[PDB]
Nucleic acid binder design. Structure first.
Lengths: 381, 511, 511, 381
DNA sequence: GTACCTACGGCTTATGAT
DNA sequence: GTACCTACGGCTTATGAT
DNA sequence: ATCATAAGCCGTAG
DNA sequence: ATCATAAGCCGTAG
């Protein structure tokens, strides 16, 4: 219990020392190698811990070391280690054991959470080292923004538009909006094919008022199918179709694609035209077609090349930026050096903790383990 | 800096873990019937090059290779999965042919990973056939440095042949094995009739199959499971009474135990029940099992009919156990209870797609080879002017430029179909006698040797040209009509059935 | 059948085990200073292709590979040996550059074999340089399917640089590390004077070296060990007193501990001795070690000189420990106590042999290449008759026969040394202008391309021919006189010394 | 003690059951899987056992299970398991632990060895399977004789000697004697080089009476050096020298060889000429030169080829014999199947046990562990 | 996912006996 | 070189309560 | 005599 | 108060 695992600090007064909970060997080794000997305490853990609701028995106990060392298990008398911090791996198993620990503490001692004593650490996730330039990155969005900054470190575009040398915050915001739109298209790709979505970037606009003339609809769908057939380098075909479902017209185009063995149609509806996704697509397409970015000249920072596509230029710039960088990803607490672990996780001036709240009394724990909530909750569509 | 965070984050964490597990670990797919662990193991064994007709190899190499390149999630589960496949009494058709202590029915675990020797079997190559022909997609590894196939271009519906049994955070599935010949017959019948009924499919396949024979009693359960997806079925062991020709005494012989039954635990429980007086008519217990078949002998107490005792055993002893049929798998990454017809249709569609992609790849390869051979033969036609042009030109690049810049005569001995002899990306400004070369063609000409100037290389080139013409014609024909494609599928399935045919093991006695 | 056997068989069994162990496990060799385990590990790392300028690799891959192909004797000892090499505080020059938790001086063991990443260092390639040039012999594995090098063609006497410490059934050895620069200087001095005395060698190399500095007191022990092979030497830690500019109090600072000392055990023993009243003048104990250097603080009790307490500690505390110098190694597979001069002489002889064999191999390779290039140039001289001969002959074998059967003209533009331009096995019936071909030469001619007919390939061939002539001349010259060989050895050793020079760490204070 | 490891048989009467001692897991698993349940007992072992003399303490005990289960540790009262058998791996570690067990029993209970109860098993060593033909081989000499038989399965030599078709027991005995002589030469190779030893096969005889004429000695040494230079395809040289150390002649040739950098001489002495090794060499050389085996024709069994060397013909025959065989070597008791283990090690009709003796009372155990015997015993030169 | 046993020599350190 | 802990669902088997 | 509570097993994972 | 006997540790191996 008290010996073997718990390695307390010199100070015996609570509310001054901190307690940590990690995986036993791989983490505790470096943790004890790098910890301080004044207000530091580490309690290792072996594997996982049983749930409270799935098997509720006051006599059921396997470790009991956490409770035995924190309190007497009843708490107002002894409140040793007023501050606790949970360090955990960044994987799904770490998140799972974190959830188990959180619900365990919540269902055992509500007061220690109400009085604001539980804390969660934020371990780093990426280590980017561009020679002398080093960087510690923790989140996917932060990594993406850092990559975008490295790619946009002082470029200067030269098109035949109104601006001879277009560069700066306008171009950066345009690239950010383009990336957001590409992410939205990648998310919606589950419904419709990607070829038409990518081609709508350069295809002209469309309005519900265009349902008057059949010639305009035919011209638009013919240009669309022709450009699709031109851009198609793989084994696929594209056909057009004009449909009228109305009293008189309600012109509705239908795009016919021929993959390996099965044809598939994709009509166009008023709801699809009115949808905010298609509206944003049309707005960005107009903004990009109003650029006249055919003949372009952008350099970062000693070489430039004229291309015929803004996305091709962006890919070339990203490649030029990612030529000479190095990235190491730490996939475990028992992977870095003790000094790095200290400085990046438990430095009272460099760490980034997290506070838990007691906002509302809800039945999340009740819906946790019934198999009914387990069947009904996966509605992530 | 300590930003305030809501307690609601607990829901975002558990949902992510549940989704990731359900998608990637437990539930298999309808197109392969294989877990990602089995997938990575088979892919590693294929890349390493451990065929069936080769020498054995240590397990440590394969385990370390899989851990290092594809599956960085320990070694214990990997070794247990490997040992599970090699056990004959655990699968209807084994996949990993091994050699060494692999455990037995007695529950004894296998030896360490530093003693066994494993390799692929003849049936294993039927799973990953035609892999490098661009038949499936490639998925990146954890760090984005390698490629992993998404689905296996299989030829046998392993999901219905062997099945699996896993449990997820939300769902749980379990499918009994079956016989290969009846599955092939049902596939052929469905190819014949797309609107076949459940009775027509049930008529060809009476019931499931097990590695060890057994006795099936309930017929309503298997039908309800085949129609909906859930049902119950009972398993009964094979036993009989024995009376000597003389006075002697009655004796029970056990020839086989039900599926997933420990023999030592069963004998211990029987001895305990006999000691507890709960069962009557039992006096002693012996064992006569050997390397010729399992044999258990139970001595019947004097003055006992034994049939009532046997019925009491069947009621209490594990010799009669039910089974929780539950068919749940993935169709587009979503758990969906699916019946037999849907699985067969998905298998047929996957086979069609694989065959079509392989045909396209082979057609493109043959087109490129024939287009290169055409220019090679043209260069073989006129040789002496090329000799002088090479002898005069100091720079090989200048020689290539001079060759490209000048037309050619297209001798009479040099001069097929009207089309389909040229690549798609080829521009109409070449091959309009009249003929022009290309930088690639010029480099191919520069890459020739002196051995290609004999009285046999010309005939070999002409034969290869005619063969490529015939092959591309046949490929265009099979791409034209789907009836030829269906005929090829039927012939391949009939050949597979003829290769790996076998006999029924279990027995179905309706009530 | 139970034949009677004598009890004397006990002696035949133990003797075999003792001999096998002593020959193969514990005692290293004077030519490498490496154990067979280290040998197999380095050979596996070299065959796999894990250089210093490449990406890291998992340890499981290397461990499983070594277990499977070369060292089938477990994994625990192999992993411990691998971790031993990566520790900076355990060797003067590390060999395995790794990344991860490798333990520390606190006695904490390293992590599992599924977390670390290791690769070779720049100094490692200096050990196994010139391996594929047939410089050493190959030894079969346990089943006779692979080849293992017997000795490593090294350039640095690792035995004297790092040393080892093993114990056998009969003997036990232990050698302290040393400095590289002084070893190179001693080798150069011995190359200068073969009859150098022990004092001349001792003058260049004062004493051993350690990864952490220390204090050496006894000078008689190291001299007796260098002269005979056995001796004792004391190691003293570095400490000092501290008194504040004000009244303050005395304080002891510990900058370094002796070699092979556990810090936690030492602190625990000091605390125990203070509690047991056995030591006086000690009040408390603290620690100030960080990532900038180890620092231990001991608070001196009030009213104490502290020097008597420090002397009592040096007498009792592990801060002063002796060392059992014992130099025993193998010379022809037999344990023999050998001095410094014998080791240096064996190193020089091994280097001479390696250089000679490499020179012979390179000379043979250059001879073969030049002999092929001669025939290639001859074929380049006359081309048109070969063209007609190839055009007429239907069979390539018949064309080769016709080429061999006919002499050649040896054009003026085609026409070195009087000899040394032909292989040894070449018969005098070829190359007697006059010239004849060979079936191998004819096949080489048949293996020509069209790119070799430009205004630059001829000049390239002539340049390569002249270069090969110069190279074979230089090789014959260096094989002629041993003085050039000794000059090359000296230049290479000076270059190696210039590459990996460093500064002394320890300190020697004579009494 | 009694549970956990010991798995006794049904019979409780001693002198009918047998006890075995092997490595615990890897061996005991298959052993229990293949053992009988009538008179079979297995006691596993974990690692090694301390020595009796190196550390003698009656209180010292770690396992004590062997003694506790065999007797009460004193023995005449209880004599359970009158028969014991020791199965052990075929490696040096197995032999070592076997020696430890033997000396342990000898120094603990002399009566159990005097009454003839200790037995040692002889596990197989090689498994040769030539398709349908299988074979179990236990010893290196047996393996060698089996290989020689497979190579000599019905060959028939056709030389120009007195026998048109020479074959059979004479040729087999000649091959056996040649192999024995080659083994003797390989053993003596540590002293003298191998080239001269191999060339003495075809070189003419020599007699101490040849020390009269210098011309004969010169002719012989010249022929020797010439043939050595002819056969030398590597980078070595050979020189001759005639020496006279006597009152008048005592002719003594000296052979000078030039390796990489150092020349080495090898004079010929009366003792070397008289040695039985050189005598056997001369006898075999005469026997082989009296064969006239230059033009030969031997077939096994459908192909023949004339060669110029009997050893080359032997190598060709060995290659032809070893073309299509398969060999598996079992390097551990936990490597084969349980049925094979049973049938080949502990079958009361197929096994091959071994009996220990109490011949003499000697101080081998005394000289075992003193380090003086350990230093003086390695005299295997 | 993890705690205690052995050989083998040379060295030491501690503790009861002459 | 080796023995006992957890999640996760669906199934069963056994045992005390209405 | 008939319902509520305590277990064991199946396969990946630690 | 001064000599003979019992341990622990170092690294490969099982």
């Amino acid at each position: 219990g008290l010996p073997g695992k718990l390695a307390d600090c010199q100070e015996r007064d609570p509310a001054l020392s901190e307690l940590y909970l990690v995986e036993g060997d791989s983490a505790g080794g470096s943790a004890k190698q790098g910890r301080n000997r004044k207000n530091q305490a580490i309690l290792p853990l072996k594997g996982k811990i049983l749930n409270v609701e799935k098997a509720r028995f006051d006599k059921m106990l396997s470790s009991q070391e956490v409770a035995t060392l924190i309190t007497a298990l009843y708490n107002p008398d002894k409140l040793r280690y007023h501050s606790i911090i949970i360090m955990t791996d960044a994987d799904v198993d770490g998140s799972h054991i974190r959830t188990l620990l959180l619900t365990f503490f919540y269902r055992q001692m509500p007061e220690i959470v109400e009085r604001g004593h539980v804390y969660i650490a934020q371990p780093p996730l990426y280590k980017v080292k561009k020679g002398k330039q080093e960087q510690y990155i923790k989140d996917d969005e932060a990594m993406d923004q850092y990559q975008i900054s490295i790619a946009l470190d002082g470029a200067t575009l030269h098109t035949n538009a109104s601006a001879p040398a277009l560069a700066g915050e306008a171009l950066e915001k345009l690239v950010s909006e383009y990336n957001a739109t590409q992410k939205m298209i990648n998310r919606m790709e589950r419904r419709y094919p990607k070829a038409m979505l990518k081609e709508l970037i350069y295809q002209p606009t469309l309005t519900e008022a265009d349902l008057s003339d059949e010639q305009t609809v035919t011209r638009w769908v013919n240009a669309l199918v022709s450009e699709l057939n031109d851009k198609e380098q793989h084994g696929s075909q594209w056909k057009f179709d004009v449909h009228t479902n109305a009293e008189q017209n309600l012109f509705e185009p239908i795009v016919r694609v021929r993959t390996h063995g099965v044809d598939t149609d994709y009509p166009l509806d008023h709801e699809f035209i009115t949808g905010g996704e298609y509206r944003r697509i049309c707005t960005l397409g107009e903004k990009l077609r109003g650029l006249l970015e055919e003949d372009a000249f952008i350099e970062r920072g000693e070489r430039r090349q004229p291309v015929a596509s803004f996305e091709q230029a962006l890919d070339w710039l990203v490649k030029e930026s990612r030529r000479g960088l190095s990235i190491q990803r730490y996939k475990g607490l028992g992977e870095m050096n003790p000094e790095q672990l200290w400085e990046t996780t438990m430095d009272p001036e460099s760490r980034r903790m997290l506070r838990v709240t007691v906002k509302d009394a809800i039945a999340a724990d009740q819906l946790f383990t019934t198999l009914m909530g387990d069947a009904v909750e996966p509605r992530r569509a | 800096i300590t930003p305030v965070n809501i307690e609601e984050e607990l829901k975002s964490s558990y949902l992510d873990y549940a989704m990731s597990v359900i998608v990637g670990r437990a539930l298999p797919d309808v197109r392969d019937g294989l877990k990602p662990v089995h997938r990575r193991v088979l892919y590693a064994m294929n890349v390493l090059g451990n065929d069936w007709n080769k020498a054995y190899k240590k397990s440590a190499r394969v385990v370390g290779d899989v851990i290092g390149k594809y599956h960085p999630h320990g070694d214990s589960a990997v070794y247990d999965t490997i040992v599970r496949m090699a056990q004959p009494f655990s699968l209807r058709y084994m996949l990993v042919d091994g050699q060494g202590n692999f455990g037995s029915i007695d529950g004894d675990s296998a030896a360490a990973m530093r003693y066994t020797e494993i390799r692929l079997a003849k049936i294993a190559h039927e799973l990953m056939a035609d892999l490098e022909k661009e038949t499936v997609d490639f998925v990146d590894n954890y760090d984005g440095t390698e490629k992993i196939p998404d689905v296996m271009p299989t030829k046998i519906p392993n999901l219905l042949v062997n099945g699996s049994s896993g449990i997820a955070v939300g769902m749980a599935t379990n499918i009994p094995p079956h016989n290969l010949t009846e599955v092939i017959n049902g596939c052929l019948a469905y190819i014949d009739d797309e609107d076949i009924s459940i009775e027509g499919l049930m008529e060809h396949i009476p019931g499931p199959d097990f590695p060890t024979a057994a006795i099936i009693n309930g017929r309503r359960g298997i039908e309800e499971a085949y129609r909906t997806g859930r049902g119950k079925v009972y398993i009964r062991a094979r036993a009989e009474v024995e009376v000597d020709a003389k006075t002697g005494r009655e004796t029970i012989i056990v020839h086989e135990i039900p599926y997933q039954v420990n023999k030592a635990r069963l004998i211990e429980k029987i001895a305990e029940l006999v000691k507890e007086k709960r069962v009557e008519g039992i006096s002693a217990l012996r064992d006569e099992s050997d390397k010729d078949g399992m044999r258990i002998v139970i001595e019947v107490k004097r003055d006992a009919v034994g049939e009532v005792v046997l019925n009491n055993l069947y009621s209490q002893t594990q010799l009669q156990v039910s089974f929780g049929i539950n068919m749940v798998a993935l169709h587009h990454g979503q758990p969906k209870i699916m019946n037999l017809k849907d699985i067969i249709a998905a298998f047929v569609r996957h086979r069609r797609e694989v065959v079509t992609r392989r045909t396209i790849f082979e057609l493109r390869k043959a087109r490129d080879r024939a287009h290169i051979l055409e220019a090679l033969a043209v260069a073989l036609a006129n040789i002496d002017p090329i000799i002088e042009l090479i002898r005069h030109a100091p720079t090989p690049a200048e020689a290539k430029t001079a060759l490209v810049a000048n037309p050619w005569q297209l001798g009479n001995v040099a001069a097929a179909g009207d089309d389909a002899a040229r690549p798609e990306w080829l521009e109409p400004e070449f091959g309009v006698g009249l003929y022009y070369l290309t930088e690639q063609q010029a480099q191919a000409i520069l890459d020739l040797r002196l051995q290609k100037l004999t009285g046999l290389e010309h005939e070999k080139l002409l034969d290869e040209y005619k063969e490529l013409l015939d092959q591309i014609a046949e490929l265009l024909r099979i791409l034209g009509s789907a009836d030829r494609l269906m005929e090829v599928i039927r012939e391949e399935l009939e050949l597979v059935r003829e290769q790996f045919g076998d006999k029924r093991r279990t027995e179905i006695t309706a009530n």
